[PDB]
Design a protein around this ligand. Structure first.
Ligand SMILES: Nc1ccn(-c2oc(COP(=O)(O)O)c(O)c2O)c(=O)n1
Ligand SMILES: Nc1ccn(-c2oc(COP(=O)(O)O)c(O)c2O)c(=O)n1
Lengths: 431, 429
């Protein structure tokens, strides 16, 4: 691990030299999710500290269109482009326009070389044998650059990215090295705790609007207040102590039996939003509302951006619970399914997973698009969603993905027939 | 005076909506001095809070060449341009290239319209009879916009600009409004104190490197150390209690009875750098070293940028004391002048300013850059260095600025060009 860093150092030292020696305009292009907003915050602090002004842009996807734009900016003043959380999959188009570019990306690469030509450096963990889907995130890749300047304090934003991208449990590889470095330098403290204590609000509100895990019987202030009053916990206190937690967990197992999902390692970071899980949820809510520049401001610790962020988070959590209560969950033999809204079927499906996989779909044209979700105990019993969604190619469509998360497309009139098929495949996977 | 605000608010509310309603790119251009870097920090926070991504650039001068560049960024995706601490004098060129522009400038305006056309809003306090040399800075103009959003905490950066532009004594007009508002909202506390207590370093170092007041006989660590030893003050203390204050004031006023401004109104602001006078000096030193993005970082309260700022500031103050000892002031008929280094020219001129205007210059390639400084006494007698330095066009260049402080460029006609400015300052006085 000490040795794997030494091979990565070769690429990060060249990235550092390329940034220091460049005196023109600098363009940063990042994603809108939590990992991309954290990456943008890391790059922003790092560039400022090395005396670089820059122009930051947030894109949902790096399409052929957007790369062709931006290439128009290249014609006079060829700026240095830093791509975060993107770029590796689009590298052919980036070479094609001869960008001066640094690509900081954890997605599977098309070209497995760190040094592409004279003008392009690619920092991608897959080139070093590190799985970008479980051992490092985009904000961790940026952090690896940042630490060549000795900016260890930016490790707190990598931890946020680690949470936002769902790589915190288990904590593997480079992610584990980053957290341990942050703890060594005292930028983070680690504390096993109950998930409700990350919000610093009245516990009955934390319970009421929690979606990790979602507990339907408690998903309202009234029901949460009453449940707490019953077991002798003051519903208005903002932190459960050890006696409260024992009493809560003892009672709650009857409503939600997988109570291990309520216990987490909390990360207390050196940041105005001291809970990394809360900062992660805040960045997520802000990015889903299009408040990109506010999200950078939150990473940069601006008080007014943090105030906006807190207001937008609790609005986003209230609306999510409401959407969750409006889902009409239908049950086949081995799965659940539901029709929902185009932007949220995947989020809703992952939230609803309990004992069986959950598939949401939305009907747009005559197309019908599906998002399937399971969990790790389902995978350990033999679930693989990619092959179950592949069956879409029998109903004139396309489907695949990962064992725990997949999608598919199938003509609008074959919906019932496709779900029956998927239901049977899955039932045989789990015997 | 509350009436002038009611007239300014109409332009600030329209700047507000013009920013809110823009969803393409946004370019911010500021100056590299304390006031311009503070303006950059104010606009950066304001824009982020309103969900605006932006590209900030810091230029030393808004030259014609610089304006033709930038204008090539209009050929596809036409940004909104925000100019701070500049643009009013260059207004005609801005109109010619048809920028979508907001001008936040306290230099004397060429066109005295707030709404130039449908494309340009110009917020100049001179347009409303407020003196941009004494009663508001470029920082305060940015803050008047910011307060339309309720961003009262941004007043602390306007106060830093007030200090960097030498408008804090006397505290007048709109700057007085801004200071009082920051006090009402508890973002600043005011406390009379000796200047040397702002540095929070050993006092003999604070005396040795102080240039307001500059005391050549104390401007060394050795002499300052001895001078304090000899009156009963531990020179390694970092702050002076009242008894050592009184003992230092009388000793200084006795041996140097013309010295002034040893007692100052300190502005303790809600900012990681708590002393606004120190923050103003730190931004100046950083900007003079070309560290523009680090200075914005300091405004945004980044710890590493502030660490660099402290280191650069003390490097800069030592270098400055060495240059002051070395300067060769030369007398013409109504000005002094000297050659010095690119980062020191302006500050030395205003340190040495006493009876007549002072003009420093440095050669940089094939041209010479001039920084002329006066005082308010000289302006009250009709100085106006803006018109005087304008005669760089009579020599193939350009000049401008404030009545009390202006600059000029090109080429190697230095003594010829110098001769002409002495001429106006005769007629002007
Ligand atoms: N032939 C394929 C291969 C992969 N995938 C894929 O599926 C998800 C989750 O699915 P959604 O996010 O679309 O619900 C991904 O993250 C992802 O790369 C697919 O859909 N089809
Ligand atoms: N053509 C011009 C017009 C204005 N100014 C200007 O002058 C000062 C004081 O002068 P320096 O340039 O010596 O700092 C400024 O703050 C500043 O914006 C200039 O330099 N040239």
């Amino acid at each position: 691990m000490m040795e794997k860093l030494k091979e990565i150092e070769k690429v990060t030292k060249a990235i550092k030299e390329k940034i220091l020696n460049h005196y023109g305009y600098i363009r940063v292009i990042t994603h809108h999710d939590t990992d991309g907003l954290s990456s943008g915050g890391i790059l922003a602090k790092m560039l400022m500290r090395t005396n670089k002004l820059f122009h930051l842009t947030v894109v949902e996807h790096l399409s052929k269109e957007v790369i062709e734009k931006l290439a128009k900016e290249n014609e006079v003043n060829k700026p240095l482009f830093i791509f975060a959380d993107m770029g590796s999959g689009q590298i052919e188009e980036i070479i094609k326009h001869n960008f001066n570019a640094i690509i900081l990306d954890h997605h599977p690469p098309v070209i497995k070389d760190s040094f592409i030509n004279e003008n392009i450096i690619q920092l991608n963990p897959h080139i070093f044998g590190v799985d970008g889907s479980r051992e490092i995130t985009a904000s961790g890749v940026c952090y690896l650059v940042a630490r060549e300047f000795g900016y260890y304090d930016l490790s707190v934003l990598a931890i946020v990215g680690i949470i936002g991208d769902m790589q915190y449990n288990p904590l593997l590889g480079l992610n584990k090295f980053i957290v341990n470095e942050a703890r060594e330098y005292r930028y983070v403290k680690i504390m096993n705790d109950i998930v409700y204590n990350i919000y610093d609000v009245e516990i009955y509100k934390a319970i009421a609007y929690c979606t990790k895990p979602y507990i339907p019987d408690l998903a309202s202030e009234g029901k949460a207040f009453k449940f707490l009053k019953d077991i002798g916990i003051d519903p208005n206190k903002k932190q459960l102590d050890d006696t409260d937690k024992k009493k809560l967990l003892s009672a709650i197992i009857f409503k939600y039996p997988k109570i291990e999902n309520l216990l987490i390692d909390r990360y207390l970071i050196e940041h105005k939003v001291r809970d990394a899980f809360l900062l992660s949820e805040m960045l997520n809510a802000v990015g889903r509302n299009g408040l990109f520049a506010v999200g950078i401001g939150i990473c940069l610790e601006d008080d007014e951006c943090i105030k906006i962020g807190n207001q937008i988070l609790w609005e986003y959590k209230k609306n999510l619970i409401n959407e969750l209560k409006s889902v009409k969950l239908k049950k086949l033999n081995n799965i659940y399914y539901f029709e929902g809204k185009k932007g949220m079927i995947g989020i809703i499906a992952s939230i609803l997973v309990d004992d069986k996989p959950v598939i949401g779909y939305h009907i747009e044209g005559d197309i019908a698009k599906f998002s399937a979700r399971g969990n790790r105990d389902l995978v350990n019993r033999g679930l693989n969603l990619s092959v179950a969604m592949a069956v879409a190619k029998e109903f004139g469509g396309n489907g695949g993905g990962h064992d725990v998360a997949s999608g598919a497309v199938v003509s609008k009139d074959k919906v019932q027939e496709f779900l029956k098929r998927v239901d049977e495949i899955i039932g045989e996977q789990l015997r």
